[PDB]
Structure formats: structure tokens, C-alpha cells
Design a protein around this ligand. Structure first.
Ligand SMILES: [Zn+2]
Length: 227
């Protein structure tokens, strides 16, 4: 019952409750003949929300904010983008228009600028070296090293053991690497091992695209990226 491209109506964004104070958000775009979905996270803190990733573009991000107000009814006050691609920063300007304080690592801001993408307003310090971790409200933000992209971050919600892997982690049904234009295929297995070692109690692992699973998605990703 996790939302998919087969059931989300065109142009809509859906939320899915994962645990106490934690939702995923799911949005779609059609590229060529194929409809794709992308996941992010929403985490409650006191009477506000922290958003992890845009909903992949400005139009979807406007829909996301409306869906959040309808279903949750608390303000999004901060966001984190987990890497520089459109599915993560596309819609940052919508978030800024809506009064959200937008964050990512310094490297992501640089890569987003270089790519001509939207750029979060604020940098997360102390994330520059592989293995760096910072607390940010109700989550930990971890830079595990280069994988899908040079800058990719993961986000853990310690109270409920939810790991948002972003595009560093593949869904179970995905058996080929697909697009690796910004990837570091050599470092990806080591990066996965760092995630495994850091979050051994995670109960839910959310990939950047596709269905949630558990810690088995980590080794699955290594297997696919070698393949
Ligand atoms: Zn990407």
C-alpha cells in the first residue's frame, strides 16, 4: 500500500506514515515513455516539520506543501537536500517562497550551482569528510562518502530507527545501476559499508526511489553497483 506510479494520480503527491512522527513523501514525473517516482522524508519536531528533499521540481513541491498542510497541518520550517540533482533540490525556490530555511552540505551547494540547479540557502557545517555526522533537530545527517554522487548524504531518525538512504541506496526490485553520470562506482561499496556500520539497528530503510525495506537494501545496492 506504499504509493507507486501505478496509483498516484498524475501531478499529485502522497504521504506515507512510516513511524511515530515520520512520513515519506512520494512524487512522480514522466520522462520519455516511463513514469518515475521519487521519495523524501518528513520528520516532526515539537510543533514544526523538517523536510528531507524536495518533491522533484517546482510544480510537485507546491503540491507537496499543500498535501502536508492537508494531512499533517504543521508548518515546514527547515529542509535538507541530500544531493545536488533535481529530485533533491528542484523546488528549493518554492520552499524559499514558502518561508522554509533550506540547507545542504557545502559541496552540494557547489555542485548544484555548477549544474545550474536551484541552490539551498544555508550550509551544514562539519560534513566535509567521509564519516562526518551532525545532529539537526530530530535527525542525524551523515556524509558516508561518494556513491551515487560525490556529495550524497543519508538521514537517520534515531527515536524510531528510520534511515533515509536517498539515491545511495537502491530498492529491492532494481537489478541494474541505470544512471551513474555523477557516481563514484569505486567508492560506493565502501560508502555502503560505512552506512551499515553506523546504523546497525535501523528498522526501516527508505531508498531514493521505490519501496521501503530494511538493512538488506544496503548489501543489495553494493551487489547491483558491481553488476
Ligand atoms: Zn541523483
Amino acid at each position: 500500500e506504499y504509493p507507486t506510479v501505478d496509483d498516484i494520480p498524475v501531478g499529485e503527491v502522497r504521504l506515507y506514515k512510516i513511524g511515530d512522527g515520520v512520513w515519506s513523501h512520494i512524487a512522480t514525473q514522466k520522462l520519455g515513455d516511463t513514469v518515475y517516482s521519487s521519495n523524501g522524508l518528513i520528520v516532526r519536531d515539537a510543533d514544526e516539520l523538517l523536510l528531507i528533499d524536495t518533491a522533484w521540481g517546482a510544480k510537485n513541491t507546491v503540491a507537496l506543501l499543500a498535501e502536508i498542510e492537508k494531512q499533517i497541518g504543521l508548518p515546514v520550517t527547515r529542509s535538507i537536500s541530500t544531493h545536488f540533482h533535481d529530485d533533491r533540490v528542484g523546488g528549493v525556490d518554492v520552499l524559499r517562497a514558502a518561508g522554509v530555511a533550506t540547507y545542504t552540505s557545502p559541496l552540494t551547494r557547489q555542485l548544484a550551482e555548477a549544474a545550474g540547479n536551484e541552490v539551498p540557502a544555508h550550509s551544514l557545517k562539519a560534513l566535509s569528510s567521509s564519516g562526518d555526522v551532525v545532529r539537526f533537530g530530530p535527525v542525524e545527517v551523515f556524509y558516508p562518502g561518494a556513491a551515487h554522487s560525490g556529495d550524497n548524504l543519508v538521514v537517520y531518525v534515531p527515536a524510531v530507527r528510520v534511515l533515509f538512504g536517498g539515491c545511495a541506496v537502491y530498492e529491492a526490485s532494481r537489478e541494474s545501476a541505470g544512471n551513474v553520470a555523477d557516481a563514484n562506482l569505486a567508492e560506493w561499496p565502501a560508502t555502503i559499508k560505512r552506512i551499515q556500520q553506523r546504523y546497525p539497528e535501523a528498522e526501516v530503510v527508505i531508498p531514493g526511489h521505490g519501496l521501503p525495506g530494511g538493512l538488506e537494501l544496503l548489501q543489495h545496492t553494493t551487489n547491483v553497483v558491481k553488476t
